[PDB]
Design a protein around this ligand. Structure first.
Ligand SMILES: CCCCCC/C=C\CCCCCCCC(=O)OC[C@@H](O)CO
Ligand SMILES: CCCCCC/C=C\CCCCCCCC(=O)OC[C@@H](O)CO
Ligand SMILES: CCCCCC/C=C\CCCCCCCC(=O)OC[C@@H](O)CO
Ligand SMILES: CCCCCC/C=C\CCCCCCCC(=O)OC[C@H](O)CO
Length: 241
């Protein structure tokens, strides 16, 4: 069996919490992978679950992929459609994600005297790894959301059509674990930091393979990276009214 289970722990401000996500192949060939993705998370005092599917198509030197998602913030009863695109290479992953709401305004879960609903937006994600030393990765994100009063950073400081850029580094001593730090900056001079740790289990790998720095290189190759989780924000950014 092939696929991935990933636990994520993150802190350090507004989106503190944890999550579990699975990538489950249902068709698997050298040239094309079709997969379901499913998971849930408790982050920023909300319980959210996510369900998706996509295809990945491979050439020896690159990969094209698309995916579709439904995101359900159960705490606040907010629903959203997600679409994604992927272009991956050795030591390089690029992704673009659209975020489209499916649920209307209604009494807000966390903010008194407000209504809330998902804010539409997109983001572009880059992840790159040093080929000579692939345990070192960096992380570029640009994200943009729309609405008169959106909470991209927190709900106590609402913002008009906020955008933000994130730079982060991360370290993967053995395939099983990644640690990193993300700095983000936007709109109103808003800043933050996210410290996070991922535990990665690979269904196709023996145990010893997953605790040996030898194999980090290969997780970061294109054929390495075939069962990695889709790269998106699985948290629904909300807007208020
Ligand atoms: C290139 C070097 C990379 C630098 C890495 C920096 C080193 C370590 C970062 C690890 C951060 C761990 C975060 C803890 C998880 C957490 O607290 O969340 C759980 C949640 O329930 C609490 O809210
Ligand atoms: C849950 C989100 C909403 C669901 C919407 C689903 C939308 C898109 C998912 C992608 C569907 C991929 C289809 C698989 C094609 C395939 O395997 O062919 C096998 C064949 O080649 C064997 O010879
Ligand atoms: C197989 C290759 C993958 C290519 C397929 C494409 C995959 C994903 C594309 C999704 C990107 C959507 C970005 C649009 C977001 C947007 O404009 O926000 C609405 C704004 O107007 C509000 O006013
Ligand atoms: C939008 C609605 C969200 C849909 C509900 C989300 C609920 C729970 C998330 C975890 C689910 C567990 C999935 C099963 C894990 C699994 O099958 O992987 C085993 C693997 O076979 C071991 O090899």
């Amino acid at each position: 069996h092939y696929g991935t289970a990933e636990v994520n722990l993150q802190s350090g401000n507004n989106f503190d919490g944890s999550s579990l996500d699975f990538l489950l192949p249902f068709y698997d060939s050298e040239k094309m992978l079709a997969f379901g993705q499913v998971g849930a998370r408790y982050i920023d005092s909300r319980f959210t679950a996510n369900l998706g599917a996509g295809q990945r198509f491979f050439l020896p030197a690159n990969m094209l992929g698309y995916n579709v998602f439904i995101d359900q913030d159960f705490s606040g009863d907010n629903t959203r459609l997600g679409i994604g695109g992927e272009y991956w290479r050795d030591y390089f992953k690029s992704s673009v994600n659209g975020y489209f709401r499916m649920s209307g305004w209604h009494e807000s879960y966390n903010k008194k005297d407000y209504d809330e609903r998902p804010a539409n937006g997109f983001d572009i994600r880059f992840n790159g790894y040093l080929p000579s030393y692939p345990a070192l990765g960096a992380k570029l994100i640009y994200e943009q959301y729309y609405g008169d009063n959106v909470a991209l950073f927190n709900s106590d400081k609402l913002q008009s059509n906020p955008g933000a850029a994130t730079v982060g580094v991360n370290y993967t001593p053995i395939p099983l674990v990644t640690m990193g730090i993300d700095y983000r900056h936007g709109t109103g001079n808003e800043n933050d930091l996210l410290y996070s740790m991922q535990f990665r289990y690979q269904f196709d790998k023996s145990w010893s393979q997953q605790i040996e720095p030898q194999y980090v290189n290969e997780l970061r190759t294109l054929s390495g990276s075939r069962y990695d989780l889709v790269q998106r924000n699985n948290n629904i950014i909300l807007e208020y009214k």
